[PDB]
Motif scaffolding. Structure first.
Motif, PDB file in Angstrom:
ATOM      1  N   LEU A 161      14.409  -9.886   5.290  1.00 35.27           N
ATOM      2  CA  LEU A 161      15.023 -11.533   4.485  1.00 35.27           C
ATOM      3  C   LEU A 161      16.210 -10.499   4.415  1.00 35.27           C
ATOM      4  O   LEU A 161      17.194 -10.985   3.559  1.00 35.27           O
ATOM      5  CB  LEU A 161      14.346 -12.152   4.800  1.00 35.27           C
ATOM      6  CG  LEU A 161      13.983 -12.909   5.647  1.00 35.27           C
ATOM      7  CD1 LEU A 161      12.307 -13.846   5.272  1.00 35.27           C
ATOM      8  CD2 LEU A 161      14.445 -13.528   6.661  1.00 35.27           C
ATOM      9  N   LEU A 164      18.205  -9.336   9.042  1.00 36.86           N
ATOM     10  CA  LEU A 164      17.473 -11.229   8.992  1.00 36.86           C
ATOM     11  C   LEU A 164      19.246 -11.095   8.808  1.00 36.86           C
ATOM     12  O   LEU A 164      18.378 -11.271   7.134  1.00 36.86           O
ATOM     13  CB  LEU A 164      16.042 -10.794   9.244  1.00 36.86           C
ATOM     14  CG  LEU A 164      14.903 -10.623  10.468  1.00 36.86           C
ATOM     15  CD1 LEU A 164      14.192 -11.400  10.149  1.00 36.86           C
ATOM     16  CD2 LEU A 164      15.807 -10.874  11.334  1.00 36.86           C
ATOM     17  N   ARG A 165      19.302 -12.363   8.841  1.00 40.03           N
ATOM     18  CA  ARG A 165      19.889 -13.481   8.180  1.00 40.03           C
ATOM     19  C   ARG A 165      19.248 -14.536   7.572  1.00 40.03           C
ATOM     20  O   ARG A 165      19.809 -14.924   6.522  1.00 40.03           O
ATOM     21  CB  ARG A 165      21.252 -13.495   8.776  1.00 40.03           C
ATOM     22  CG  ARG A 165      22.250 -12.884   9.396  1.00 40.03           C
ATOM     23  CD  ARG A 165      22.666 -12.190   8.727  1.00 40.03           C
ATOM     24  NE  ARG A 165      23.656 -12.352   7.519  1.00 40.03           N
ATOM     25  CZ  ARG A 165      23.561 -11.819   6.431  1.00 40.03           C
ATOM     26  NH1 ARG A 165      23.240 -10.167   6.103  1.00 40.03           N
ATOM     27  NH2 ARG A 165      24.336 -12.050   5.381  1.00 40.03           N
ATOM     28  N   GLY A 166      17.965 -15.111   7.828  1.00 40.36           N
ATOM     29  CA  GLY A 166      17.113 -16.086   7.770  1.00 40.36           C
ATOM     30  C   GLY A 166      15.908 -16.239   8.794  1.00 40.36           C
ATOM     31  O   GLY A 166      16.300 -15.962   9.894  1.00 40.36           O
ATOM     32  N   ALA A 167      15.868 -17.051   8.600  1.00 42.26           N
ATOM     33  CA  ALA A 167      14.498 -18.367   9.359  1.00 42.26           C
ATOM     34  C   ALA A 167      14.937 -19.330   9.529  1.00 42.26           C
ATOM     35  O   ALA A 167      14.582 -20.458   8.583  1.00 42.26           O
ATOM     36  CB  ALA A 167      13.287 -17.662   9.063  1.00 42.26           C
ATOM     37  N   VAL A 176      19.385 -15.054  13.336  1.00 41.37           N
ATOM     38  CA  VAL A 176      17.951 -15.812  12.585  1.00 41.37           C
ATOM     39  C   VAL A 176      17.054 -16.102  13.409  1.00 41.37           C
ATOM     40  O   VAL A 176      17.229 -16.344  14.419  1.00 41.37           O
ATOM     41  CB  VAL A 176      18.715 -17.145  12.377  1.00 41.37           C
ATOM     42  CG1 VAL A 176      17.477 -17.956  11.913  1.00 41.37           C
ATOM     43  CG2 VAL A 176      20.075 -17.051  11.814  1.00 41.37           C
TER      44      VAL A 176
END
Ligand code: B12
Ligand code: SF4
Ligand code: SF4
Ligand code: NI
Ligand code: NI
Lengths: 313, 442, 126, 531
Positions: C58, C63-66, C95
């Motif tokens: 992250l 990874l751009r986000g969750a 994501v």
């Protein structure tokens, strides 16, 4: 009656050995050997002659009389063989590198191979000893030195299959012989190992084993039959490479061939028995599906060439 | 073979000689025994199974007791598929247009070239006597060959029925091969050979004409045939032979289900090395009876060795008898040499030992019929097996010599043996078999 | 036992089961996620049994986000349409998506709960 | 010492000089991979899988250095640094400890270094197997009736194992009175790896028997808590201790099983208390769980059988299909053994056979099984049936110990063993039955198999089950009776099913066997006709 016309879905791949106008192609057949009625045989079987780097002390007396003035020098020996008999290829066996006998550094054998290969126009096959550890280093040096001529390296057995594969096909653009011992499954395994390494079916030939007539010959015959039927009948892609059988390696060392007339007076001429053993072994393996044979006596070479010419034409 | 068991009466009366009806069913399924040996067989099923058990290729028997040879009976085109049943036979060609010196030389060659290799006697099997134009010389040659004392079967090659009628009674009692049936004289030839159930040789130009002639002969009721594939050249002869065999086997056609006779002397123009090459070819490629110009050891050794190799049963290779082998008449005190059951291995080792002329007892354990290392790598050749066989064989017959030699190519087996045979002196000898005679000498 | 005994009252002429089923993988508790993340931990560095590999991906931006996709269905929306479209858009934008409840079951029915889905729908980083 | 032969190549003082090793990886794809120019994805795939390169970036890193590192990552080369960076797992890693940077890089690039020699004073070779040392030569003795000894190979997480950690708990053999002495020996080998699983634990353990036997002066026979080891006095002289056990075991585990074993820890325990405590804690639970897994595995639970073609050297058409309930008919290849062989030795005798295209589960017919049999047998055998003896049966090679043949008058099947030289009800002896059955030929009504398949649930499942067994030699019956009775009790029959089966002592003849069966109430006389 109805003519038997069973068709095959497979085709043996073609491998080119040598450079120039002397380069020979092996494979391409879609049918069983000499079955010109069933279809097409891609390339005619090729016959090669065997020479050594050292003087052939253990060979029979007639063979030492044939090469009495050239056997000292491998370059002169190769040039003499090419000028007198003109074989399809020449097999230069480096027996001076055999660890059990006289042992030589790979540099010297590589120098001899380079000297031989830069004096002849015919394709050259460089065969090592039976030791895998010695063979890896020997073939690395030989392939480095004899670069640019598309030579064939024999006995790339599994134990060193990477090394002879890397120093051969991959690095210096040579061809290799994947060697197994009287087993179709071992031949499949070595072919698959060569393919996974990154070496295509156009870059190596197979040696499914060779033996003299009367000494485990039926195992060689059955292995040849099985690999041919699997490659053609089953379209088995891993068995569709041409097969080379060194006949003079085993057929010329047996008691029938090597016993002098004084040793067995009832048997007769030693040269005739040697030529007969070579011709019988080569004829059988050619009928069973080999693509190239290595012969020692020039009379055997002539007889086998006439045999191939009569059967194909 | 369980299908024929249903047709069997399923009454284990043991009249057939086979322990059970299922045993008889499995014996005749393998083709070893015909179907007629059941006395209680129901007639309809008897005929049905007479047709069903019928082999695809008929077996022709030529010669008497000591010269009896079986030709044909094959079931597959490659030995690895099932096996090769009957080995091919070799004939030496004689002709009435020959000098007496040449005939005597060929007879002496037939008598001289005779040896034993791995339990099989390699010798010339047939004399093929060809008619070349003169009746009197042909009869004189037949009588000369008969009186020479050669132990061979006879194949009379004579398309002339008039000459054949006089020549046949000279060798009729010896069950010969009568070759010479054509598209015009096959009636008289069938009449000649029908009385004594002699094998009849059939020849024609081309495969289609041969097929038609064989059908015409079979419509006369005769089935004891040996086919000549013909061919004016080597290529055409090879094609005809292969096509006959594949039509019989792959096509399931009984018309070509007969052994073939190939005259290699005429194809090669009496070329010795071409004769060897073509003899190997037709040994591997359906040649039942190969006729050669002459016979010497240069021809005999490789051809007979290869023929012995090819016609071994793949499932049951050649294995020497278990026990203690006496070489060079070993006395009480003689070194003991141990080696595997494999026939080739024993052949080579005993050849080395017999040439050494040293009295050496030899012990063969049960290694599974494999070479020393093949069996060793498979684990069937260990020190435990050698100890077990040494204890059981009965080496006690001769004593006062405890030096035991073991195959040198397998040296890891040493450590166990000295524990399993404390009194015996276990020696791991040299690997190569050529070292054996000197080691026995010293 | 009451449910089993009711099988005798089955009317097989009224039965129609669509031949539409989908393989799914589930069971991703925090403990299971940490166990999976332990594979991409260099042993000579560590630590083990933490969310540190996830924090690393992250923070680095791989990874751009969750995003958590949760909730029910509603007749006001074409059933499962919004769940599937939202999930596919998010994973296409790198994501990572965690799902619960009826949204998770919509993802299961559609076929997103599969390893193969990574190469079929996800962006390069995911 | 810098040089090409010394494998220390300085490229240049500028960052751009790192491209000179990048082109080495690029041209490796061009030269050895045979990839044409412009096939960038194939070249990047090649360098990622084939070129074991990695980057160690030391000192402060400028933006240009980081962007060049992204180029190394683009080629699949992980970048290691001592600087604080936005770490990416397996690709960009920070390792400040310079004493562990080499080990971190080798793990990050999956690089394994082959230990050329085992650091032991005593000679290690395969030729020293089976050299029994007697009481006179012996110094130490472990296991047997003298004391308790055990060996165990267990899979554990990487944290619990330490690479090349050889420790000895308790006294060594140097404290021995110089007389042949007794002391407990516990051998514990923990192995960790990415591809290692529990089913592979027994396989490695078996190789222990060989690994110890290749050392001259020591001999190991036995298994699990039946360990039986002897160490000679000559080993004591040369300098052999208990740590060399661990050194040899670690070296051979990393050599033979490098595919599945990444880290190995060997522990030698000599204390009377610790050895028993570890045997109770670790050894016996795993032995029990291995036995339970062997017992409880059935064809339904698994979804992959295994094909073996090792015996095609003498039976060209023979293919063995190994299921959890149908062993390899040689008796030595199991479902777990086949799985371990496939994992450890790809392109070997054992290959996977998916359970697809089920046609008849009662008979044992799958479309994928038929396809694989047709492929492997080179087309000689096309359709096979796993559980039936009469309809498309499996072939036999010749290594089998037992032969099952059909007896229609008894409406059952008889069984013969290799050691049984006398005749059978069927007539043929074992040799004739072996000639009829083996060789890779499909012969309905006859089959070859091992002693373990007799008491299987799938033994002749297509013809009813093992209730068809009507005759069997007394030794075979006594060997199999317990499990045969268990399976018959599950089938439909009173537990003592062995007593109803005839043998050579009672009768060896058709009518006598039939009379005994019909007077004994054998279930084979009450089933449907076998054919
Ligand atoms: C033909 C062959 C087969 C055939 C036939 C075997 C047979 N029944 O003979 C078959 C397919 C069965 C076979 C199988 C296998 N084979 Co194999 N086989 C061979 C081959 C090509 C030739 C063997 C032969 O015919 N020897 C002829 C006899 C005469 O040799 P011999 O018994 O060794 O005898 C010599 C010496 O031992 C000595 N000698 C004999 N007895 C005695 C006694 C004393 C006292 C002394 C001093 C000397 C002595 O005299 C002879 C010298 O002339 C060899 C390769 C080669 N060129 O050696 C591979 C080879 C032996 N096979 C080998 C192996 C490993 C196998 C298998 C175990 C696995 C495999 N497929 O490779 C299987 C096992 C099958 C089984 N269930 O047993 C290896 C052995 C390696 C090793 N060091 O362990 C070889 C070298 C192949 C290879 N891949 O490198 N094989
Ligand atoms: S003779 Fe016929 S009926 Fe009698 S046992 Fe033999 S096969 Fe059966
Ligand atoms: S019998 Fe055993 S060794 Fe032979 S093919 Fe079957 S599983 Fe492999
Ligand atoms: Ni087998
Ligand atoms: Ni077998």
């Amino acid at each position: 009656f109805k003519k038997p016309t069973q068709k095959f879905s497979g085709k043996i791949g073609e491998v080119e050995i040598g450079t120039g106008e002397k380069a020979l192609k092996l494979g391409g057949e879609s049918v069983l050997p000499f079955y010109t009625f069933d279809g097409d045989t891609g390339n005619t079987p090729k016959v090669g002659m065997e020479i050594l780097d050292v003087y052939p002390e253990d060979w029979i007396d007639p063979l030492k009389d044939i090469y009495k003035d050239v056997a000292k020098d491998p370059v002169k020996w190769a040039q003499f063989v090419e000028e007198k008999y003109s074989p399809d290829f020449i097999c230069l066996r480096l027996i001076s590198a055999d660890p059990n006998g006289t042992d030589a550094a790979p540099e010297d054998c590589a120098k001899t191979a380079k000297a031989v290969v830069e004096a002849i126009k015919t394709p050259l096959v460089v065969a090592g000893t039976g030791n895998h550890e010695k063979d890896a280093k020997l073939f690395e040096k030989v392939a480095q030195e004899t670069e640019g001529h598309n030579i064939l390296l024999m006995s790339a057995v599994e134990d060193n299959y990477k090394s002879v594969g890397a120093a051969g096909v991959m690095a210096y653009n040579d061809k290799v012989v994947a060697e197994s011992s009287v087993d179709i499954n071992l031949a499949k395994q070595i072919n698959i190992l060569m393919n996974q390494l990154g070496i295509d079916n156009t870059k190596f030939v197979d040696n499914v084993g060779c033996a003299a007539g009367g000494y485990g010959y039926e195992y060689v015959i059955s292995t040849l039959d099985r690999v041919k039927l699997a490659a053609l009948g089953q379209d088995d892609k891993t068995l569709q490479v041409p097969i080379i059988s060194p006949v003079s390696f085993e057929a010329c060392k047996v008691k029938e061939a090597m016993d002098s007339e004084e040793d067995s007076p009832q048997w007769g001429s030693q040269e005739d028995r040697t030529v007969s053993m070579e011709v019988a072994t080569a004829s059988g393996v050619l009928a069973s599906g080999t693509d190239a044979v290595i012969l020692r006596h020039p009379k055997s070479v002539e007889v086998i060439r006439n045999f191939i010419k009569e059967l194909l034409g | 073979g369980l299908n024929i068991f249903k047709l069997t009466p399923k009454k284990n009366c043991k009249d057939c000689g086979f322990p059970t009806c299922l045993a008889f069913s499995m014996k005749v399924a393998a083709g070893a025994v015909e179907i007629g040996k059941c006395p209680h067989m129901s007639d309809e099923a008897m005929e049905k199974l007479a047709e069903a058990t019928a082999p695809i290729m008929k077996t022709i028997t030529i010669g008497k007791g000591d010269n009896e040879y079986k030709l044909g009976g094959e079931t597959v085109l490659f030995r690895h598929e099932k096996t090769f049943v009957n080995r091919n036979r070799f004939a030496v060609a004689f002709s009435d247009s020959m000098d007496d010196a040449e005939v005597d030389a060929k007879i002496q060659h037939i008598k001289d070239v005779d040896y034993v290799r791995i339990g099989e006697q390699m010798k010339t099997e047939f004399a093929a006597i060809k008619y070349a134009g003169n009746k009197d010389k042909y009869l004189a040659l037949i009588n000369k060959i008969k009186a020479s004392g050669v132990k061979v079967a006879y194949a009379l090659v004579c398309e002339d029925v008039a000459v054949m009628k006089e020549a046949l009674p000279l060798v009729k009692d010896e069950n010969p091969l009568v070759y010479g049936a054509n598209k015009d004289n096959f009636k008289e030839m069938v009449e000649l050979v029908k009385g004594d159930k002699l094998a009849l040789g059939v020849k024609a130009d081309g495969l289609e004409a041969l097929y038609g002639l064989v059908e015409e002969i079979q419509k006369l009721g005769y089935k004891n045939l040996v086919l000549d594939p013909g061919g004016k050249s080597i290529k055409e002869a090879f094609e005809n032979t292969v096509q006959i065999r594949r039509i019989n086997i792959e096509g399931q056609d009984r018309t070509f289900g007969y052994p073939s006779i190939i005259f290699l002397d005429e194809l090669t123009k009496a070329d010795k090395f071409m004769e060897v090459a073509l003899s190997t070819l037709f040994t591997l490629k359906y040649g039942s009876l190969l006729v050669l110009s002459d016979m010497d050891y240069s021809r005999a050794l490789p051809l007979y060795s290869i023929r012995q190799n090819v016609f071994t049963d793949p499932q049951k290779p050649m294995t020497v008898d278990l026990g203690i082998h006496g070489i060079n008449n070993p006395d009480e005190n003689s070194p003991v040499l141990c080696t595997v059951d494999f026939a080739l291995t024993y052949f080579l080792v005993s050849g080395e030992v017999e040439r050494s002329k040293v009295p050496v007892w030899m012990v063969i354990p049960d290694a599974g019929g494999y070479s020393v290392l093949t069996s060793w790598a498979a684990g069937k050749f260990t020190g435990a097996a050698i100890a077990d066989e040494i204890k059981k064989c009965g080496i006690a017959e001769k004593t006062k010599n405890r030096t035991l030699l073991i195959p040198g190519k397998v040296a890891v087996l040493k450590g166990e043996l000295e524990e399993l045979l404390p009194d015996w002196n276990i020696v791991i000898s040299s690997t190569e078999a050529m070292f054996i005679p000197k080691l026995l000498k010293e | 036992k009451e449910a089993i005994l009711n099988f005798k009252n089955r009317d097989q002429s009224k039965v129609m089961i669509p031949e539409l089923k989908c393989k799914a993988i589930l069971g991703y508790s925090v403990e299971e996620i940490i166990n999976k993340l332990d594979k991409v931990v260099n042993t000579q560095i560590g630590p083990m049994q933490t969310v540190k590999p996830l924090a690393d991906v992250l923070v680095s931006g791989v990874l751009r986000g969750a995003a958590a996709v949760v909730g029910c269905n509603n007749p006001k929306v074409v059933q499962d349409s919004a769940h599937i479209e939202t999930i596919k858009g998010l994973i296409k934008n790198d994501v990572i998506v965690v799902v619960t409840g009826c949204a998770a079951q919509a993802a299961a029915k559609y076929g997103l709960l599969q390893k193969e889905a990574a190469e079929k729908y996800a962006g390069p980083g995911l | 010492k810098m040089g090409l032969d010394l494998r220390v190549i300085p490229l240049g003082y500028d960052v751009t000089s790192v491209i000179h090793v990048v082109t080495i990886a690029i041209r490796a794809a061009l030269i050895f991979g045979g990839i044409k120019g412009g096939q960038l994805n194939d070249i990047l795939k090649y360098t990622a899988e084939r070129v074991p390169a990695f980057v160690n970036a030391f000192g402060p890193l400028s933006e240009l250095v980081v962007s060049a590192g992204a180029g190394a990552i683009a080629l699949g080369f992980p970048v290691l640094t001592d600087q604080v960076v936005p770490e990416v797992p397996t690709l960009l890693l920070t390792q400040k400890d310079y004493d562990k940077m080499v080990k971190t890089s080798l793990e990050a690039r999956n690089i394994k270094i082959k230990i050329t020699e085992i650091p032991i004073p005593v000679s290690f070779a395969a030729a020293f197997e089976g050299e029994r040392i007697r009481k006179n030569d012996m110094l130490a003795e472990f296991g047997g009736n003298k004391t308790k000894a055990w060996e165990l190979v267990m899979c554990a997480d990487q944290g619990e194992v330490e690479d090349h950690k050889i420790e000895v708990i308790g006294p060594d053999i140097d404290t021995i009175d110089k007389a042949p002495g007794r002391m407990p020996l516990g051998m514990l080998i923990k192995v960790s790896g990415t591809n290692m699983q529990k089913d592979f634990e027994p396989v490695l353990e078996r190789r222990l028997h060989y690994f110890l036997n290749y050392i001259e002066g020591v001999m190991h026979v036995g298994q699990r808590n039946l360990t039986w080891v002897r160490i000679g006095k000559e080993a004591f002289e040369k300098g052999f201790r208990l740590k060399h056990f661990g050194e040899v075991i670690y070296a051979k585990m990393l050599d033979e099983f490098g595919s599945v074993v990444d880290k190995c820890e060997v522990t030698i325990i000599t204390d009377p208390g610790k050895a028993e405590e570890l045997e109770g804690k670790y050894a016996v639970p795993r032995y029990k769980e291995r036995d339970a897994r062997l017992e409880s595995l059935v064809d339904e639970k698994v979804d992959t059988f295994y094909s073996c073609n090792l015996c095609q050297s003498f039976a060209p058409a023979h293919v063995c299909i190994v299921t959890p309930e149908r062993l390899g008919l040689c008796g030595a290849v199991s479902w777990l053994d086949a799985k371990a062989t496939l994992e450890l030795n790809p392109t070997g005798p054992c290959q996977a056979v998916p359970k697809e295209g089920v046609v008849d589960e009662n008979l044992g017919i799958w479309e994928k099984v038929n396809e694989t049999v047709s492929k492997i047998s080179q087309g000689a055998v096309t359709s096979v049936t796993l559980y039936s003896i009469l309809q498309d049966p499996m072939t036999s090679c010749g290594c089998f110990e037992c032969i099952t043949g059909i007896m229609p008058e008894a409406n059952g099947v008889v069984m013969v063993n290799r050691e049984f030289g006398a005749t059978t009800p069927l007539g043929m002896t074992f040799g004739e039955l072996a000639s009829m059955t083996g060789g890779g030929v499909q012969t309905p009504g006859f089959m070859g198999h091992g002693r373990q398949f007799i008491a299987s649930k799938k033994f002749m499942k297509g013809e009813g089950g093992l209730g068809r067994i009507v005759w069997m030699p007394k030794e075979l019956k006594d060997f199999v009776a317990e499990k045969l009775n268990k399976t018959a009790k599950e089938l439909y029959n009173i537990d003592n099913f062995a007593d109803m089966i005839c043998d050579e002592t009672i009768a060896t003849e058709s009518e006598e066997v039939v009379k005994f069966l019909e007077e004994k109430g054998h279930p084979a006389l009450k089933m449907d006709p076998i054919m």
